[PDB]
Amino acid sequence: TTRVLTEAAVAGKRDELRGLKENVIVGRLIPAGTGYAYHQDRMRRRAAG
Amino acid sequence: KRVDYSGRSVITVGPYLRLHQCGLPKKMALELFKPFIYGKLELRGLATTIKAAKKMVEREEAVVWDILDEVIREHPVLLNRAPTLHRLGIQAFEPVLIEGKAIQLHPLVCAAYNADFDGDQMAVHVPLTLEAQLEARALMMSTNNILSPANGEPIIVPSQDVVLGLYYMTRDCVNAKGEGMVLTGPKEAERLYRSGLASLHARVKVRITEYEKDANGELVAKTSLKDTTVGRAILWMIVPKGLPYSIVNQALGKKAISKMLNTCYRILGLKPTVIFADQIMYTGFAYAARSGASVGIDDMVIPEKKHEIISEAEAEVAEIQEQFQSGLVTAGERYNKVIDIWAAANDRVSKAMMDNLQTETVINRDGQEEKQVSFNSIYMMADSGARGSAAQIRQLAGMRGLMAKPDGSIIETPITANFREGLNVLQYFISTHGARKGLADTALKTANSGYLTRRLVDVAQDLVVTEDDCGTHEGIMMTPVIEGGDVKEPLRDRVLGRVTAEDVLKPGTADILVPRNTLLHEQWCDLLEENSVDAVKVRSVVSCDTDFGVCAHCYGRDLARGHIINKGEAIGVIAAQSIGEPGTQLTMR
Amino acid sequence: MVYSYTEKKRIRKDFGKRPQVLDVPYLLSIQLDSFQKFIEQDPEGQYGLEAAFRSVFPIQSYSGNSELQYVSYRLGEPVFDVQECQIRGVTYSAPLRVKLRLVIYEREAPEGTVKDIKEQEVYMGEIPLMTDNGTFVINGTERVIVSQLHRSPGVFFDSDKGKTHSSGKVLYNARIIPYRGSWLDFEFDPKDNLFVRIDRRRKLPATIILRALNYTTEQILDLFFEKVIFEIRDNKLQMELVPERLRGETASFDIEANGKVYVEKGRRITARHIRQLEKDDVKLIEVPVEYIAGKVVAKDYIDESTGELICAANMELSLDLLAKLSQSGHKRIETLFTNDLDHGPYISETLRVDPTNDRLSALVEIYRMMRPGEPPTREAAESLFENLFFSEDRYDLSAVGRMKFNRSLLREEIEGSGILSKDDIIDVMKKLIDIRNGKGEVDDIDHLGNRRIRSVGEMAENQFRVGLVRVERAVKERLSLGDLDTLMPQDMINAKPISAAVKEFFGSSQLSQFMDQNNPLSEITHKRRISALGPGGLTRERAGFEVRDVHPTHYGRVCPIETPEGPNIGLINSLSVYAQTNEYGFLETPYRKVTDGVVTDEIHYLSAIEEGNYVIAQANSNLDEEGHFVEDLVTCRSKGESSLFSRDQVDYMDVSTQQVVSVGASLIPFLEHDDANRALMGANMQRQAVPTLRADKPLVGTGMERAVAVDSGVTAVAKRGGVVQYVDASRIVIKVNEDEMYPGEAGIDIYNLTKYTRSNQNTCINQMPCVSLGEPVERGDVLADGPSTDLGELALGQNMRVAFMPWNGYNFEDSILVSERVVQEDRFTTIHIQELACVSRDTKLGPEEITADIPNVGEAALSKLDESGIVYIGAEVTGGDILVGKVTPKGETQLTPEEKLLRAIFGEKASDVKDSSLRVPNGVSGTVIDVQVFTRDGVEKDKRALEIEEMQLKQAKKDLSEELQILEAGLFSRIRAVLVAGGVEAEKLDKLPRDRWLELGLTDEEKQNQLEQLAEQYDELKHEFEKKLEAKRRKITQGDDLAPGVLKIVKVYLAVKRRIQPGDKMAGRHGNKGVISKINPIEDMPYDENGTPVDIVLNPLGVPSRMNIGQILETHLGMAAKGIGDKINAMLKQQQEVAKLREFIQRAYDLGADVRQKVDLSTFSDEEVMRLAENLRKGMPIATPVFDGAKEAEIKELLKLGDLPTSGQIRLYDGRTGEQFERPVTVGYMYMLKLNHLVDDKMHARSTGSYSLVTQQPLGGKAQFGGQRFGEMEVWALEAYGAAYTLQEMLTVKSDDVNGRTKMYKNIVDGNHQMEPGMPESFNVLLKEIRSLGINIELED
Amino acid sequence: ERMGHIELASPTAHIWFLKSLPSRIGLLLDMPLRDIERVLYFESYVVIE
């Protein structure tokens, strides 16, 4: 963890919460199974705003 | 993070309580669904205040039990094994109240949950939202999860008492009471329960009304008078209409019942095969309990020529030690051919064993010499496969064999005994090395398997289905594995759950067998096998050009369904877990 | 002939074919021997505490002319007793005192002592004294420290090669491990270079350490290497070649042998040529110059004229070098051999590697290692190097280490110094280079001749030495400062450090652990366990695969069966039955000396090294009457290769077949008929057995259970008794006969039993007496019966009627059916003891007292409370009922008219106190046994504390009154017997003592003086009684000492009876375990032809796959025994005559082959046989040896006598439909055991409880109504299902989402069933802790 | 939810950087690890300009 954190802070990267573990840790619907449609709708509405 | 509605229940056998059910002890109840009890009490006008509801719940009145029963009656519940490896370690069931304190688990799902009815703790979970109940009902029920997500073979593999009893009642000594009787098929049980004939009766003629779906989408009746035994006759009333009578007319081993369930699933469907398995297992419990199937010291038989074989082996050992003393033979050759002679003696002992335990028994008859399969218990279950194997039985009647391995070597003199005639001190002292090595291997390799599976899940989690077709002709080449002495696996299932490309061609020039995008559901395999094709072009996961996940047009199904995989299903989670699940590998080379 | 009165009531028949020769030893000798010898006053200081003083005791000031000496030590008598400590809670111990001596000497006088201060001793700590059973009562509880298996000190030459080399080359290193200090290592490199390593740190060159030991290069070359003369004079270049010394090299050219050429040029060397060269005398022979270039000079040579450094040591000779060196220096130059075939330098290659040559330069390199900075100054390096290894008071490994040192180098002497020497290390490298070149075999880590065992005595000694060496420094510094004083030696001698160190060692250490009380067999084996983890050996259960193996040398030393199957497998072990400890650290096993065929009865204990030399016969060998052998070839072992041997080749034989087995697994009958794994699990779950209310003796046993019962010290035995007078359920008095009575005593012994006493596993230990009234008692016989003991026999379980039958799927794999009869018969019912305690904790607001004035509570809750607050003895309780009423004072307030009015109206509370009473935890129901309260001195409230004081006081006076009463009776009888024939009849004395008729003996006042003496003795006895009773009384109510914060402690003991129900973990004895799944009613069960139903339905499908023939054998033998018992019961209930019953009993006791010679009608009386039969009316007791048991023909022969079928198959009917079962069933009687793995502890649910402050999660593992923990494999499987909304519920509804749990609860109670995720609080926790460091992190929009 | 802060006027380095496998300060100043770790403890006295 520590080296990854240092590298991210050095580079200044953003996650966008695309991995399943991201939705797990934040605690939202993962883009798989039943929540796939909701994730797709969220991605679609993100295009317009 | 800790779980709220959960914890530490014990496992018991559910002979009753069919698959879509489970037994939740009542003392565990009334707590998990206490908010539901409060809601029902307020809705029914039984508690104007929450404190009244709390006091009456704490006092445990009969009306409280009635409300519990009314609310739990439509509320499925989910169960989990604490050490879990694959998807079937977690399944959902319908709770049933039983006055005890250990949850009743069905015998069949025991294989998936990998339990053993020893000291174990189950994790119980309640989904509360309507959607979560629905998600449990639609995907995590056992009735739907008949097949493996790993290979395709059915996880539900009935065994033990059920297979032993079924194999027993589909038998005949030579001819039981009332051999020549003829009846229609329902009367077989009518006369079996009361008097007149035994289930071991053979040469019985019955009129069987078979039903076959020859035409498209409908079955036609067919009647026949084939000769059949009693157990098959009474088992025919339990088999549904679709299946023929040939499958139920056999010694009916574990593979027989396995392929029977496979036929019922593929031909009839989900619910027919589920109810078929349910009723089969009920028959298994009933007939095993009716059969008896006792065991004893004399049930096993020690072959007599074992002493003669041992004497000849000892004479050979005396000869070889004399030869070594003569100086003609070196030491390594001496050990090696001592091992060879002892292995030959072991093989001969095992052969005399199986001969004394095989279909070698005389029954009274006009010819007075009728050698039919004996009814010894150990050989019975070995043929059936209920529990144990002929390899294990070899250690019970004949000799153990060598069983000599301190670290890597093999000791000269093997162990010559069985658990009936006793065993010596030094030999038992030696024999523990393999046992302790296996124990150490298991205890030190479960952790390695767990870490391997963790690594696999972490590395293959981002995979998901998000696109339909890749529109690419690139694919992997699939051919039968032709190496070693013979073929290890023919081109039968490597393309079963796969989709062919446009590169499939007939052996004849300017001839085609199937168009580009076609799924080999169940019959194209036979067509391509008839053409003796060796090379098949099938798009793989890497072959598909999508730049994101894997499209469904290159993966097939490989699931307990009958249709192509749908969008949103996470193959990567489906993958990376089946591979390391069989953590029964070997360590220390 | 065997009398055996205490078990003459019931004699257990045996089929031991072999004759026993040696009795089982005390079986607890190891755990007691070290402790008893540690506190043993020895005339010579070798081990124990005397050796602990004499090591570093003499204190000498820094030229202060002052010394400290001691005479001897004595151990103070313990303040309390075992049961007193167990009642109170103090650690049982004994104070230490030793006489000191300060001697001060004046200056200007050589050792001129002027004064001594040896007049008073000082106390330094208390040594925790042992009990009779090798236990300790530290902190009130019974405490045991396990003996450790570790690596014996010495030098061990291992390979450490193979795949770990990663170069395809074998390695040969050497390590020396002293008992204390630093470890010295000698590794080997693939470049054929040696390296020196200390403390597993960075490597060093091989020879620099040798240079550090004042060694020059020429000495090194001369000692390690052999120097040939190499005499080349007048350019002859003639070599002295010894074919016997060096050979095996092909000659190149120009080779002769004393004139005529023997080996031709370019010809391969042959043995004939070597023999011819050795036969004739060979002088110096000329050789080509080519042999000089590759050859290296041995010593440094200098020219005769000048002394340049030409031809330096360890330098190859050159062609241009040769001419000028021969011209100037000399003609003969010492050189080497360098035979790569059978030798290898491995040092000359390393000599040039060394950057330092001088001793001073080499001295600082090691210092540069262990100190990176602070370079030395020619004083620190030398002294530190002297201190590291060659110092006396810092290395002091052992004498056993020196033993192994000399044994590994083939030395005859056994006595030496703990320090090392140069010859030792040079011989070490010599042996290393010989082994690498090839001279012997490597050592074995797993061999037992290399590992030893440390008991608790030596650990106590080492801990005491460490604690004393610290106080020695303080004593020294205080003696050096202000030495001009005559004060008593308490200057710096503090008992606090030693006491704290010893308490920490005993209390909290990895070896010491709580002792299992659950079974007497687990009791005896837990003190026999041997571990490798701890201070030494292996630091963890990881890092090893072959260390935990069973070596072939574990034959009679450790049992290869008893070991846990968990991650700690292969490291936790247990000694054998006859295995003892060697003199130093090792294990010894007895064999029998076989001389010229015959077998002598003498006993000899041999070790792992001693057993590997001679020939030992196998126990399963027949013997002749004179001790000869029947067959010529006997299977025997010599060096780990068992094979046949003649009767003239064997030297030893085993004692019994029990030698390999422990005590844990010796009790399983027919052990040879079960697999290994099942033997392991049977032994392991046996310890988890639990005694029940009515202990039931085992029908089929092995006989060692009797010895285990009589050696665990759990029951009550009689010591020097002759006959019993009074018997009570809790107290037994024995009247010793005058034969075993010595003068000066009353002649009685009292034994107070153990009634419902809490055990470590919260079980119950209850002792049940054996004799009834007026029974003649011998010595060494049992009187009470402790847990799972019957008539002095380990009886752990009940014998249940069991059948091998599938029953409608109630026995699918491992599920077991139980009878309603068994639960109705209250079999297996278990009783447990739970405990509660409470304190006061005086605060600044005021002390807290117990007076039962709880506000805001109903009278019904207080309706059972007594005035002081505790509950009456014998009550029952369920739920959260109040037990002890405690309140907390509150701070005073101002006038405050509100509660001023409230007090004026209500009063007596004034909100002064808060309800802080002790209540029962929820989900707990039971009944109380007894209460207990302790109050510190200075507080004498004692509202209801006096009842226990007076109860124990009356108990004390009662049980002390008997001896004084009987002494008074004896003296009064003497008085009556001395006045006879003196004109006074016994009527006067009987009516009244009358002061012994006014003591009017007369008879010239001599008899008068005699009666005066008797009256004086009576008065002295009265005085002794009064002083004894007052001493006991002051001991009783003296008061206790508690923590400063606490005021008083109240402890309450509760009892719960626990029955059988499905879900319980029942287990057998042959590796078969089962969960109960149904309590079937009696009617439904299978019933025999006589209507007797079966008790337990067992699944017969587990027979072939687990190899458990022992189970069926025990069931058939149970049929034999139960049939015999039923026949005897019918024989007795008919009220038949004695003679035929006796004849039948004799015919039963002598059935079978030749085992034992016992016959009734010659010893047993006409009344003994009645009770003997009445005892064995419910079954025939049988005992079978471990690997010398019965035969199948024997069992079948037994079955016919009780009218049983030989096959064991019996027809059964259905208790539900009554149809006769085909396939006749083998039913039987098995010895089942109940385990603490009970469902009444496992159940746990939660709907809404308490969460943590940290990350806001619930507590967890049933700690105050907790919950279970969800797994990551589980979320993986859920994703395999893809129920994303289910995971959202999983992460929000029931998670740390504080704003979601309330809303979901409302949605449920309103029936909404709607969820909004929000955000877990643990994510905010993660964000806050990340922002705690120099890293920004935030979430965009 | 509320944080606290310490002034710490004396400059302090962060041990996460420059102490992992890559040295952020080492690769920024092109200096070896040994030199920087030595100078951080007031016993090297590096020249600035």
Alpha-carbon distance of C766 to C755, in angstroms, equals: 5
Pairing relationship of beta strands C113-116 and C121-127 according to DSSP bridges: unpaired
Residue pair C509/C140 in contact (Cβ under 8 Å)? The answer is no
Q: What Cα–Cα distance (Å) separates residue C1221 from each residue in B300, C124, C164, C1199?
A: 20, 78, 64, 23
Counting one residue from chain A and one from chain C, the pairs whose CB atoms sit within 8 A come to: 52
Chain centroid to CA C115: 50
CA B434 to chain centre: 27
CB spacing of D14 vs C1324 below 8 angstroms: no
Domain CATH for C1148: 2.40.270.10
Instruction: Please name which of C429, C427, C428, C434 lies closest in space to residue C344, comparing C-alpha atoms.
Output: C434
Please tell me the distance from the alpha carbon of residue C283 to that of residue C644, in angstroms, as a whole number. 54
| C-alpha to C-alpha distance for C129 and C40, rounded to whole angstroms | 12
B116 labelled as ligand-binding? yes
- Single-letter residue type at B267: I
CB of C789 within 8 A of CB of C858? Answer: no
Q: Contacts of residue B131 in chain A, CB cutoff 8 Å?
A: 34
Deposited resolution, Å: 5.8
One-letter amino acid for residue C591 of the chain: Y
Distance from CA of B37 to the nearest CA of A (A): 29
Q: Name the amino acid, one letter, at D17.
A: F
CATH number at residue C913: 2.40.50.150
The answer to whether the Cβ–Cβ distance between B426 and C637 falls below 8 Å is yes
| Buried/exposed A6-21: b ≥16 CB within 10 Å, e otherwise | beebeeeeeeeeeebe
Give the Cα separation of C1171 and C1183 in Å (integer). 20
CA distance B568 to chain A (A): 5
Q: Residue B120 annotated as binding?
A: yes
3-class DSSP state of C119: coil
Selected residues 363-382 of chain B with any CB under 8 Å from a CB in chain C:
375, 377-378, 381-382
Q: Do C1046 and C928 share a structural domain?
A: yes
* C353 inside domain: yes
User: Which among C943, C1072, C955, C335 is positioned nearest to C680, based on CA atoms?
Assistant: C1072
Instruction: Please list, in sequence order, all residues whose beta carbon lies within 8 angstroms of the beta carbon of residue C1219, skipping any fewer than 6 positions away.
Output: B290, C1213
Residues 6+ apart with CB under 8 A from C441: none
According to DSSP, the residues that pair with C926 across neighbouring strands are C877
Tokens of C1063: 């879900």
Q: What is the DSSP letter of B566?
A: P
User: How many CB atoms are closer than 10 A to CB C1209?
Assistant: 18
Q: Which residues of B touch C1102 (CB under 8 A)?
A: 387
Is C322:C175 a contact under the CB 8 Å cutoff? Answer: no
For residue C1320, give the chain A residue with the closest CA: A27
> Residue A35: closest CA among chain C residues belongs to which residue?
C1284
Q: Do A35 and C1295 make contact, defined as CB atoms within 8 angstroms?
A: no
According to DSSP, the β-strands at C1096-1098 and C798-804 are: parallel
* ∠ Cα D5 D8 D11 (to 5°): 130
C1319 CB neighbours in chain A (<8 A) are: 26-27
Task: From C772, C785, C793, select the one nearest C723 (Cα to Cα).
Answer: C772
Q: Are C344 and C436 in contact (CB under 8 A)?
A: yes
Q: In angstroms, rounded to a whole number, what is the distance separating the alpha carbons of residues C988 and C693?
A: 54
Closest approach of chain D CAs to the CA of C1331, in angstroms?
9
Please state at what angle helix C946-978 crosses helix C1006-1036, rounded to 10 degrees. 170
**Which of C1324, C1331, C1333 faces D16 most closely, judged by CB atoms?**
C1333
> Two tokens at C1178?
């419910």
CA distance B94 to C785: 51
Instruction: Based on the fold, state whether residues C555 and C482 are members of the same structural domain.
Output: yes
The DSSP string of B99-161 is SSSSEEE-STTHHHHT--SSS--EEEE---SHHHHHHHHHHSBTTT--B-SSSSSBS----TH
CA distance to partner chain B, nearest, from residue A12 (Å): 22
Q: Does C1324 touch chain B (CB under 8 A)?
A: no
Q: Are residues C174 and C119 in the same domain?
A: no
CATH number at residue C954: 6.10.140.1670
The DSSP H or E segment spanning B457 is helix B425-459
> Any idea what DSSP says for residue C771?
-
Distance CA B498, CA B515 (A): 14
Give the CATH number of the domain where residue C737 resides.
2.40.50.100
Tokens of C1167: 């009344």
Please give the structure tokens belonging to residue C118: 């040896």
The alpha carbon of residue D19 is apart from the nearest alpha carbon of chain A, in Å, by 10
Does B419 contact chain C (CB < 8 Å)?
A: yes
Q: Looking at the complex, does the CB of residue C1107 fall below 8 Å from at least one CB of chain B? A: yes
Domain contains C739: yes
What residue numbers bound the domain in which C703 lies? 657-713+789-828+1059-1242
Distances (CA, A) of C891 to C846, C848, C911: 9, 13, 10
Q: Are C1073 and C686 spatial neighbours (Cβ–Cβ below 8 Å)? A: no
Rounded to 5 degrees, φ, ψ at B24 are -95, 115
D46: number of CA atoms within 13 Å, CB side?
A: 12
C874 plus C743 within the same structural domain: no
Of D3, D14, D16, the CB nearest to C1331: D3
Amino acid in the structure at residue C1283: A
Could you tell me if C988 and C855 lie in one domain? no
Distance of alpha carbon C1118 from alpha carbon C1112, whole angstroms: 10
**Distance from C-alpha of C546 to C-alpha of C551, rounded to nearest angstrom:** 9
Same domain, C929 and C945: no
d(CA C966, CA C747): 9
Question: Please, are residues B466 and B547 in contact by the beta-carbon 8 Å criterion?
Answer: no
Ramachandran region of residue C1262, left (φ > 0), alpha (ψ -120 to 50) or beta? Answer: left
Q: Which of A1, A29, A42, A45 to mutate to test the interface with C (most CBs of C within 10 A)?
A: A29
* B437: three-class secondary structure by DSSP: helix
End-to-end CA distance of chain B: give it in Å, rounded: 39
Amino acid making up residue C136 = F
Distances (CA, A) of C675 to B79, B394, B418, C401: 35, 13, 10, 41
| Chain B positions in Cβ-Cβ contact with residue A15 (cut-off 8 Å) | none
Enumerate residues 6+ apart whose C-beta is below 8 A from B44: B67
B381 to chain C, minimum CA–CA distance in Å? Answer: 8
- Closest residue in B to C1103 (Cα) is B295
* Dihedral sign, Cα of residue B538, residue B543, residue B547, residue B548: positive
What are the C-alpha distances in Å from B210 to residues B221, B270, C823, C1218? 6, 21, 52, 36
Return the residue of A nearest to C1290 by Cα.
Answer: A27
Strands C1073-1080 and C815-819 turn out to be parallel
Interface of A with D in 11-40 (CB under 8 A): none
Residues C901 and B361: their CA atoms lie apart, in Å, by 103
- How far, in Å, are B126, B462, C8, C1098 from residue B556 at the CA level? 33, 20, 80, 47
Q: Domain check: are C142 and C73 in the same one?
A: yes
Chain A residues closer than 8 Å to D17 by CB: 6
In angstroms and rounded to an integer, the radius of gyration of the C-alpha atoms of chain C is 42
Contacts of C456 (CB under 8 A, 6+ apart): C31, C34, C35, C145, C147
- Does residue C10 belong to any structural domain of this protein? no
Helices vs. strands in chain B: H and E counts, helices first: 17, 18
User: Which of C444, C461, C479 is a domain's end point?
Assistant: C444
Do strands C1073-1080 and C764-765 pair parallel, antiparallel, or not at all (unpaired)?
Answer: unpaired
The rounded distance, in Å, linking the Cα atoms of C799 and C696 is: 7
Would residue C589 count as lying in a domain?
yes
Specify whether C474 is located in the same domain as C535: yes
Is C491 found in the same domain as C405?
Answer: no
Question: Which of these three, C343, C362, C392, is where a domain ends?
Answer: C343
Q: Flag if A33 and B568 touch (Cβ within 8 Å).
A: yes
Closest CA to C200 of C184, C217, C180, C215: C184
CA separation for the pair C936, B399 (Å, rounded):
72
- Provide the residue count of chain B: 589
Q: Which residues of D touch A2 (CB under 8 A)?
A: 16, 20
CA distance C431 to C1172: 70
Last residue of a domain, one of C528, C548, C575: C575
Quote the radius of gyration of chain A (alpha carbons, Å). Answer: 14
Judging by DSSP bridges, how do beta strands C643-645 and C634-637 pair with one another? antiparallel
What residues have CB less than 8 Å from C17, skipping those under 6 apart?
Answer: C1153, C1154, C1155, C1185, C1188
Indicate the number of domains in chain C. 9
Contact A19, B462 (CB under 8 A): yes
CA distances from C1212 to B542, C472, C548 (A): 65, 81, 49
Chain breaks in chain B (C to N over 2.5 A) after: none
**DSSP bridge partners of C285:** C239
Examine the domain organization and report whether C1268 and C1195 are in the same domain: no
DSSP state of B467: -
Has residue C16 been placed in a domain? Answer: no
Are 3 or more Cβ–Cβ pairs between D and B shorter than 8 Å?
no
CB contact under 8 Å between C1291 and A20, yes or no, is no
The amino acid that residue B466 corresponds to is T
Q: Tokens 């499958």 — which residue?
A: B247
Q: Helix, strand, or coil here: B98?
A: strand
Those residues with Cβ within 8 angstroms of residue A44's Cβ, 6 or more apart along the chain or in another chain: none
**CA dist., res. B414 & res. B395, Å (int):** 13
One domain for residues C1099 and C1174: yes
H helices within C203-329, ranges in order? 208-212, 217-224, 271-279, 290-293, 319-328
CA Rg value for chain B: 30
Q: Per the domain annotation, does C1044 fall within a domain?
A: yes
User: Is residue C1249 in a domain?
Assistant: no
Within 10 A of C107 (CB to CB), how many other CB atoms are there?
8
Which of these, C1339, C400, C360, C1308, lies nearest to B132 by C-alpha position?
C1308
Please list every residue in chain A whose beta carbon sits closer than 8 Å to the beta carbon of residue C1336.
9
**A contacts of D20 (beta carbons < 8 Å):** 2-3, 6
- Chain D positions in Cβ-Cβ contact with residue A3 (cut-off 8 Å): 20-21
A17 touches chain B (CB under 8 A): no
Q: Which residue of A has its CA nearest to D28?
A: A10
Determine the distance from the C-alpha atom of residue C715 to the mean position of all C-alpha atoms in its chain, rounded to a whole number.
Answer: 22
How far apart (Å, rounded) are the C-alpha atoms in residues A29 and C998? Answer: 108
C1247 in contact with A at a CB cutoff of 8 Å?
no
Q: Which residue of C has its CA nearest to B290?
A: C1221
B454 touches chain A (CB under 8 A): no
Chain D contact set for A6 (CB, 8 A): 16-17, 20, 24
Shared-domain flag, residues C1021 and C980: yes
CA separation for the pair C390, C402 (Å, rounded): 14
Q: How far are the Cα atoms of B69, C169, C201, C445 from residue C161, in angstroms, in the given order?
A: 69, 7, 20, 14
What whole-number distance in Å separates Cα of residue C124 and Cα of residue C146?
26
Q: Do C1334 and D14 touch (CB under 8 A)?
A: yes
- C-alpha B354/C-alpha B373 separation (Å) is 12
Find the helix packing angle between B50-59 and B62-72, rounded to 10°. Answer: 100
Alpha-carbon span C204 to B48, nearest angstrom: 87
Between CA C500 and CA C919 the distance in angstroms is 36
Q: With contacts defined as CB-CB under 8 Å, which chain C residues touch B406?
A: 552
Contact B539, B470 (CB under 8 A): yes
In 3D, which of B497, B469, B459 has the Cα closest to residue B573? B459
Q: What is the DSSP letter of B27?
A: T
Question: Nearest-5° angle of CA A38, CA A41, CA A44?
Answer: 155
Q: Does A24 lie at the interface with B, CB-CB under 8 angstroms?
A: no
Structure tokens at B69: 């029963």
Nearest Cα residue to C713 out of C128, C7, C8, C82: C82
CA distance C512 to C146: 6
Distance CA C588, CA C607 (A): 5
What's the CATH code of the domain at C157? 3.90.1110.10
The verdict on residue C5 lying in a domain is no
| Buried-exposed string C622-647: b where 16+ CB fall within 10 A, e elsewhere | eeeeeeebeeeebbbbbeeebebbeb
